[PDB]
Amino acid sequence: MQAPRLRVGIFDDGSSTVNMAEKLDSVGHYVTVLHAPEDIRDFELVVIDAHGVEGYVEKLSAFARRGQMFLHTSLTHGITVMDPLETSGGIVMSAHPIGQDRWVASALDELGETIVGLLVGELGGSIVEIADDKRAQLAAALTYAGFLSTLQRDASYFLDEFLGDPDVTSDIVMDSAQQFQALPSLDEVIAQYDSINNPGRQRLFRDLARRQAEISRAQDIELWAIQK
Amino acid sequence: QAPRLRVGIFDDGSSTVNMAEKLDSVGHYVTVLHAPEDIRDFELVVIDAHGVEGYVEKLSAFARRGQMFLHTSLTHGITVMDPLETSGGIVMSAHPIGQDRWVASALDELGETIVGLLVGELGGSIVEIADDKRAQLAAALTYAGFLSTLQRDASYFLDEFLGDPDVTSDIVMDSAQQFQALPSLDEVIAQYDSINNPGRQRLFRDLARRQAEISRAQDIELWAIQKE
C-alpha cells in the first residue's frame, strides 16, 4: 500500500527551518508555496510551516473546506491550535523533526493520526510519544544541548591562546567533554576565576562552577558562586 | 630501558594526576609515603598534591645530596622547590594537560634531562608554557572540563522526553558538533520559563548570555543580564 501524491499548499514564513515544502516535494507530492489564505481552496493538504501557527489558523479559518487536511510544523504548539480547522470540517495534524529522524506528531482524530504517521514514515522518520503539554520544555532541552557548541568553541579559542595548536586544543577539549572530573578546591576555583582576562568567559566559568557545585552538592563552591 | 628508580610519593587526594600509577606502570619502584622523614631510602620524591609549599617545608629538613624532587601542580612554578635545591636536591615539575601533552620545568640541565626522560617514558611530549601563564592555563583546562557538566546535564534533561539514552546521546552530540543561531528573544524567554529544574534554568540563561555576547545579539544579552 502507498498513499496518493497530494496537491499541497504550503505557507512558508521564514521562521521555521523544518523545510517541509522541500521534504514533501522530494517524496513526490505536488507542493505550491501559497501567499494568500484564499489560495488553499483547490489543495488536498494545507501545510503551515511557520512558528506563528495561531496567526495562520485565524487567517485560514474562513477558507477551510470539509475533508481538507491541515498540518503545522511548530514544535511548541499542541494540536488544539488547529481546533478552528477541525470544527470547520478539516483533518488536522502536526509533525516536527527533532533530530536523528525522530519526530513529534499530533492529531485530533484516528484519520489524522494514521495520515500523519504515514507522512512521517515517508520522510524516513519515527514518532516519539510526548505530551503536548511538555513541548515547550522539549524545545528548551534541545536549545540547552545546543549550547554545547557555544562552550566547545569558546573553550577551544581560550585554550588555544596557550597552546597555539588548534588540532591538539580541539582533541583536549573533546576529551574534556567525555571524561568526568570533580571540582577542584574552592581556593583553586577562585584562583582560576580570578585569572580569566575575558569578562564573558570569567562570568560563565563562575556560572558553570555553580551548576557543577549544585549537581555534586559542593556547597562551599555553590555559596561562593552565588555571592557574585 | 634506563635505570628504574626507588620513588617515594606524597598523595593526599588533592591531585588527579595519579603519578604513582603512572610511574608504577613503567616499572619504577613506587611507594606512597605518609611521613616526611620516610624519604630517606628514596631516589625520587614526588609531591603529587596541590599544597606544594607545605610539602616543601616539611621535606626541607630531610632532603639529602643528589635526591630528586618532582611536583605535579600545574599552577606552581619551579621556584617553590628552591628550599630542596638549597639542600642538594635535583628539583623538577611535570603536569599532564591532556592528549599526552605535559608542562614541565627544572632549574638545571640535569633536572631538565631527567623530567624529559620521565615524561617520555609516560608516552608524553612537553609543551612550553611560561610561569606567568600557568594559573590561566589551569582555568582554561577547567573551563573546557565544564563541557562534561553541561553534556551530562543536557543528556539527562533531553532523556526525560526520549527515554532512549543512545538516541539522546546522538541528538546531544549533533547539537554540540553543529552550530545553530540563537532563537528569537521571545522564544528564548519561552524556553527559559519552561525549565522546571532551577539550576538548569539559571545555566540556560547564562549560556544564552554567553552566546549572545559572542554573536552580538544584544536584546538576548540585555534580557539575560536583567534576569541576574
Question: Which of B224, B157, B219 minimizes the C-alpha distance to A143?
Answer: B157
- In the DSSP assignment, the letter for residue A5 is P
Query: What is the extent of the structural domain holding B134?
Result: 130-228
A72: cell is: 503545522
Which one of A102, A130, A158 terminates a domain? Answer: A130
Same domain, B141 and B47: no
Half-sphere exposure (CA, 13 Å, Cβ side) for A144? 33
Contact A192 B147 (CB under 8 A): no
Same domain, A73 and A12: yes
Same domain, B5 and B100: yes
When CB atoms are compared, the residue of A149, A162, A181 closest to B176 is: A149
Instruction: With beta carbons less than 8 A apart as the criterion, state whether A13 and A50 touch.
Output: yes
- Which residues from A are below 8 Å from B142, CB to CB? 184, 189, 192, 205
DSSP SS3 for A161: helix
- Which residues from A are below 8 Å from B177, CB to CB? 149
B42: cell is: 628514596
Q: Where are the alpha helices (DSSP H) in chain A?
A: 20-26, 53-60, 83-87, 110-122, 135-163, 166-178, 186-195, 199-216, 219-226
Question: What's at A194, amino acid-wise?
Answer: D
Same domain, A195 and A163: yes
Technique employed here was X-ray
Same domain, B82 and B161: no
Question: If you measure CA to CA, which chain A residue comes closest to B184?
Answer: A15
CA–CA distance, A163 with A127 (Å, rounded to integer): 45
When CB atoms are compared, the residue of A134, A150, A161 closest to B161 is: A134
We report the CATH number of the domain holding residue A10 as 3.40.50.720
Same domain, A156 and A185: yes
CA distance B66 to chain A (A): 32
**Cβ-proximal residues to B125 (8 Å cutoff; 6+ apart), any chain:** B100, B101, B102, B119
Tell me the count of A-B CB pairs closer than 8 A. 223
Which one of A71, A100, A130 terminates a domain? Answer: A130
DSSP SS3 for A74: coil
Long-range contacts of A186-191 (CB under 8 A, 24+ apart): A186/A220, A186/A221, A186/A224, A188/B50, A188/B75, A188/B138, A189/A221, A189/A224, A189/B142, A190/A224, A191/B75, A191/B135, A191/B138
Count how many domains chain A has.
2
Question: Is residue B72 exposed (0-12), middle (13-18) or buried (19+ Cβ within 10 Å)?
Answer: buried
DSSP SS3 for B159: helix
We report the CATH number of the domain holding residue B224 as 1.10.1040.40
Q: In what order do the strands lie in the sheet with B101-106?
A: B29-32, B6-10, B44-47, B68-71, B90-98, B101-106, B125-126
Contact B207 A204 (CB under 8 A): yes
A21: cell is: 515544502
When CB atoms are compared, the residue of A154, A178, A195 closest to B135 is: A195
Contact B147 A98 (CB under 8 A): no
Contact A180 B210 (CB under 8 A): no
Contact A154 B199 (CB under 8 A): no
CA–CA distance, A149 with B211 (Å, rounded to integer): 10
